[PDB]
Ligand binder design. Sequence first.
Ligand SMILES: [Ca+2]
Ligand SMILES: [Ca+2]
Ligand SMILES: [Ca+2]
Ligand SMILES: [Ca+2]
Ligand SMILES: [Ca+2]
Ligand SMILES: [Ca+2]
Ligand SMILES: [Ca+2]
Ligand SMILES: [Ca+2]
Ligand SMILES: [Ca+2]
Ligand SMILES: [Ca+2]
Ligand SMILES: [Ca+2]
Ligand SMILES: [Ca+2]
Lengths: 264, 265, 268, 267, 48
Amino acid sequence: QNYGINLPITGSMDITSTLCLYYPTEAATEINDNSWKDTLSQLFLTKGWPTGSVYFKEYTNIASFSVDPQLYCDYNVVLMKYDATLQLDMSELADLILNEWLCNPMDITLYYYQQTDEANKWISMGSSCTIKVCPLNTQTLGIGCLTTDATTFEEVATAEKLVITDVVDGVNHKLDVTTATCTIRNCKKLGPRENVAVIQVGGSDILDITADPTTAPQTERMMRINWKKWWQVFYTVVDYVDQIIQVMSKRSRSLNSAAFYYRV
Amino acid sequence: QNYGINLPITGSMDIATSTLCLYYPTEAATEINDNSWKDTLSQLFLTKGWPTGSVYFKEYTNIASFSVDPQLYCDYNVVLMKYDATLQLDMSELADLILNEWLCNPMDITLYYYQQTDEANKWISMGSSCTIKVCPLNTQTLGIGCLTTDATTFEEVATAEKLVITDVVDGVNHKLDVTTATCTIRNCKKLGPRENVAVIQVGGSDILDITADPTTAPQTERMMRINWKKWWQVFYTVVDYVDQIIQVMSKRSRSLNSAAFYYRV
Amino acid sequence: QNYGINLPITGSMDIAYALTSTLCLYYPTEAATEINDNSWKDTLSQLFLTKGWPTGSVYFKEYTNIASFSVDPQLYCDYNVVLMKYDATLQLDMSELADLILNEWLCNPMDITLYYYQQTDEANKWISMGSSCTIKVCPLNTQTLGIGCLTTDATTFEEVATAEKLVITDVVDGVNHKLDVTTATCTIRNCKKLGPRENVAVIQVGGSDILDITADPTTAPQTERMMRINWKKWWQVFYTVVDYVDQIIQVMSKRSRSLNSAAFYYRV
Amino acid sequence: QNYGINLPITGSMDIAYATSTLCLYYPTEAATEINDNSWKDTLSQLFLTKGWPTGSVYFKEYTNIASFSVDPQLYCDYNVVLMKYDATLQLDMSELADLILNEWLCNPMDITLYYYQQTDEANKWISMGSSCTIKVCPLNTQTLGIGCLTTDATTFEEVATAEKLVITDVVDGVNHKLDVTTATCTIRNCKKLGPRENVAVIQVGGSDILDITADPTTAPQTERMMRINWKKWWQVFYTVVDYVDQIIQVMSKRSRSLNSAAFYYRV
Amino acid sequence: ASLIYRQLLTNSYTVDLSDEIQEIGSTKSQNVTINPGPFAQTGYAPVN
Ligand SMILES: [Ca+2]
Ligand SMILES: [Ca+2]
Ligand SMILES: [Ca+2]
Ligand SMILES: [Ca+2]
Ligand SMILES: [Ca+2]
Ligand SMILES: [Ca+2]
Ligand SMILES: [Ca+2]
Ligand SMILES: [Ca+2]
Ligand SMILES: [Ca+2]
Ligand SMILES: [Ca+2]
Ligand SMILES: [Ca+2]
Ligand SMILES: [Ca+2]
C-alpha cells in the first residue's frame, strides 16, 4: 500500500467478475425472441458465470456506438458487424476502445494546437464532427491556408461521429471544428486496454489500430468469425467464453495500485 | 502491476506540462462583459509561468446545474463557487463530491432493497430532478412507519435536487422511491481525498461540511475562501497566487476519465 | 507388424542418411467453360508428365459450385488440390468446406427423434450435409425442459441453419439439446475432429484470406495447405498449379490415416 | 510416425495385471411385427441396464438383405446385423457376411478399356448396385477368348444376373473381358485384408449356412457369426439386449474405421 | 471441547429432516410458463 511509487519487484524462477456483451440491434432483430438474454444467461451459468454477472448492451450501429462508447464492466466483448465501406470507422472505434487514452481539453477558439509526438492524437466525438486544420509556420502564418478565412482550411473529417486526427508533429495548427455538435480532445495513447475485446463478424481482418502506416498489429483481443446466424454467433461466444476471457485481462487502471497513475 | 505497493521504501532523514482548469459561474463572465478576458487570463498565466495553451476556462450557469455529474478535466482543477445563504447544503454536497474520491455502483431501486454498509457508504443521486423517498424495513422486511406497497407514506429525504448525498441508518434495509426518469442514484463509497481539485468560495462564511459525521467539519487546505466585490479582482487574485494554490494541490490524483466518481458494475 | 500399440520411436540426432502417387485436381465448371477447349485436360496431363507425373496419374474432377461440392466431398486420392472460387457472400460456406476437407472427422450417427444431444468437448461438432439442412435446436435445463423454447413446439426452437447444403453447428458444451433437423433431405452426424488431413489442400482463387477452420473465435490458423492466389484467367491459374505442383505436394503429405500403420487407429 | 509397429513388445508371463456406440441393423419385418411406436425407446432403456448410456445405441432398418447389400454402411463402434434366414438367399447372405465381416481394399475398375486378372487367392471382384449383370470371357496368352468371341458379348460366360451384390472369383493369372452392366452397377477390384471385429452377424432361423471364404475346402465359423432360433422379434431383441455383454466381448471396436464404408478405396 | 465442532459437523444429515419438516408446513404454489417473444402486430381490418 505504498501507492504512487514504482518499486522493483523481485521474483524467483525456481518455484467475482462481470462480463458485458455489446451487440448490434440487427442481432436481436434476427433472434426475434424476447427470452434470448435469459437463455444466454443460463448458458453462461453452465459455463460458470453466476446469474446476473452477464450484461447485454445493444447499440444501433457502429456510428451511434462510436459516440463516447463507455464500457463499464470487468470484461467487455463487442460484436462488430463488418461493412466494407466502414473500414476506417471500425478501425477508429477499435483503436478508441482497445487502448487507454489520456485526454485533455481543447479550446480551438483560443489556442493553436500541435501534436507533441507519435502517441498524441486529436479525438473528436459528437453528432457531426467536421474538422478543418490550417498549419502555421514559425511566424504564425498559414501554410497553404489563411487563418482569417476558414474556407481555405484543409478538411480532415466530415459529419463524423468519431474521428481520430493525426497532423504532422511539431507544427501548430488552427482548428475549425464544429464545437456545436462535436467535442475534440487532445489525447495521448497510454497503452492497451485489456478490459475490452472486439469480435468482428464478416470481413477479412481489416483493422489498423496504429496511426503508424508501417504497422497494422493484430492483437489477441482482435478476433474475427465468419457468420450466417446470430444464434450461432452467440453460441460460439458462450461456448468459448473461457478462451475470450483468457485473451482479455483485468483493467490495469481499474486495479488498485493504479492509484495516482490515472486510476480507472 | 503492484507497482511494488506491497513493498517498503526506506529513506534517509539526513540526505539532501500540466493543465489548469478554472471553473467559474456565468455571473462572472456577465459582470466582466469582455470577450477577450479568457485570452487576457491566458497571457497573465503565461507571465506567472504557465505555457500558453495550458489554462482552460470552463463555465457553468449555477451551482445546482454544475452539480449534475461534474467533470474534472485538467491536471489541476480550481472551482470558483459563489456563496448563497440558501444553498449551504448544495455547496457542501458539491464540494464533497468534487473534493473526495468516490467509488459508485449502480442501484436498481425498482427490484431491490438497499442498505448502507458503513459510514463511508452514501447514496449519491444526480439528474434533472432527484426526489428520493425512503421506507426503512424491519428484520421481517416490513416497513417501519411506512407501508411498502404505498409510496405516499414514505419519508422524503430529497426534493427536486440536482445532487443529493443521502445518508440513512447503516444495517437497515430501505425501499427507495425515486424519479428514475429524471434522476439516477448510485451506491457510493468515499475512498478518500482528491488533491486534484480545489474550491475557492467567493462570498459568505466558512460553511462546508464535507463529512456526513455531525461531530466533524474539516476545513482542508483545498477549501479556500475570499471576500469579493469585483470578478476581475477575484481572477487577478487567482492568477497572482496560482503558485500557492498549486502548492496546496497535487496533480497525481488526476483520473483517466474526468468523471467525479469511479463507476463499477 | 505390432499394430494398434504405441511403441516409442528412437532416432539419432547425429547421423547422415545419404510418381507412384496419384493427384486429383478439383475445379469448378466455370474454369472449363472459360477455357473452352475440349483437350484441355489432355494438355494439362502432358504438362504434368513434363513435371514428372506419369500419364493417367492426374485426375480432373469438376464440381458445379462450392455449395454442391460441399455435399459429401469424397476425395479418394493420394493428393488432392481443390481450387475454390472466392465469393464475398460465401465466407462461412468456404470456411465450412475447408474445415470439412482439411481436417479428419470421426462421426457417429444421430437419431434426433430418440435422443437429446450434447457436445462434450471443444472438438465435438454437429456436421450436417444434404440437399437442404434446417437445424433448429432447443437447449434443455436439467429437467429436460427447454430454455427459451418449448420442447413440444418446434416453432419456438432457435434456428442455426436454413437450407444449408453443409453446416457445422457448435452449441454450448455440456447442455442437452433437442434438435429438429429436416432429416427428409439432410443427414446430421455427431463428429469429433481427430486432426488435420494431409491429403487435401485448398487454393482460394480470388479474394482475401478469410478461411478460419477453428470454431474457437480466438484463433484463425492459416496452415500450409490453405493457399490463395489472384486471378483473371483460368489458363493462368492452371499453369501456375502445374508449374508449382512440386511446392504444393511438399506442403501436403500422404494421408496419415491411410498408411497401413494406422490399422486399429481409425483406418486400415 | 508408424506407431513403432516395427519395434517389438516384451511382456512377462507372470506379472499379475487383471462412449462406445452400438448399431443394431434389423429388417423391416422386425419393426412391422413389433408394431410399437416406442420400441426403440424401450430397447434403449433396457440397454441402459446392460450399461450403454442413453444416446449410444442406434437402430438401423433395412428393407431386405438384397437392398442392405447395396453399399452397406457400418456406423457404430459395434455393429450387430440381424439377418433373416431365407433358404433361397444363402449365397446372398454369404456375400453380405463376407463383405461386412472382412476388411477389403478396393481399387477402381474401368471395364470398357482394360482387361483384368485376379492376382492371388485374396483378390476378388466386388460389384454392387441396383442390378449387377456380369459376363466374363477369359483370354489366352494371345488375347483371344477361350470359348467366347471377344467382340460379341452374347458368347461371354455369365457369372451374375440382376444381383445387388456379387463377389466374383475367376481363375487367377488369366485375363478376362467383362461385359458388366455399368449403368446400374459399379465393379471394383478388391483384396481381402483380414477380419473386421467391429461387426457381428446374428442369423435368425436357418441351419448355419454361411461360407465367408472363396476357398471351397474351408467354411470357417468365426466367433462373430451367430445363429438363434426365433418365433417373435420381441424375443430376438430381448435375447440380444440380455446377452449384449457376450456379443461385445466376442467383438472388438479397434477395427472401427474412419468412414462408414465397408471397404477402403484406393485410386 | 472440540467434540462440539466435530459432532456439529458429523450429525448434519438431520438438517435435511428439519428441512422436510419445514417444507411440509410451507404453503405451495405453482407458476405457468410465460408466452415470450416480439408479438406480431395485428390491427383492425380496413372497413367502411
Ligand atoms: Ca487551403
Ligand atoms: Ca470515423
Ligand atoms: Ca501526429
Ligand atoms: Ca443537493
Ligand atoms: Ca410515513
Ligand atoms: Ca449511513
Ligand atoms: Ca454452409
Ligand atoms: Ca425461442
Ligand atoms: Ca460446442
Ligand atoms: Ca461361350
Ligand atoms: Ca449376390
Ligand atoms: Ca480368383
